[PDB]
């Protein structure tokens, strides 16, 4: 259903340095053997200064629907979270609750610690068996 033309999705890659990241994209077409999906990124560009959004043909395994958006005023310590960083969604864990509705999130591969506001975060959900799953 999320494969249908024009439907908004999120896509990932397994090229090293990309595993764990989800970028927002829109479906352009799909195979009706291949089972591939043609997509256009929303914030990623083809190259350089960039006027053309990047297009890509990915296996259906690397495509999922966009997770439902929630009203979120606060996250708790050790909450598993998605952070919107460098135009991509990165999964990490809240390791410190800061003041002014801000949070420290710890990431791995490579190990890192970043500061985020509440608006840059959402709950981490994996898309498994046609269902959204929290850890």
């Amino acid at each position: 259903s999320h494969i249908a033309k024009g439907s908004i999705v999120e896509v990932t890659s397994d090229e090293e340095g990309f595993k764990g990241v989800w970028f927002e994209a829109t479906v352009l077409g799909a195979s009706s053997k291949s089972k591939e999906v043609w997509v256009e990124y929303k914030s990623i560009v083809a190259e350089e200064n960039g006027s053309e959004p990047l297009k890509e043909v990915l296996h259906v395994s690397f495509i999922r629907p966009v997770p439902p958006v929630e009203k979120i005023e606060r996250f708790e310590l050790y909450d598993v979270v998605d952070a919107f960083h460098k135009d991509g969604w990165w999964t990490g864990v809240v390791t410190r609750v800061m003041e002014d509705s801000r949070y420290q999130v710890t990431f791995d591969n490579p190990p890192d610690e970043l500061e985020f506001g509440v608006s840059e975060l959402r709950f981490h959900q994996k898309w498994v068996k046609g269902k959204w799953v929290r850890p």
């Binding site: 914030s43 350089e48 960039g50 135009d87």
Partner: peptide, 10 residues
């Protein structure tokens, strides 16, 4: 607003 490689980490 960025190429795919300036989105990658390190």
């Amino acid at each position: 607003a960025r190429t795919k490689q300036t989105a990658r980490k390190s």
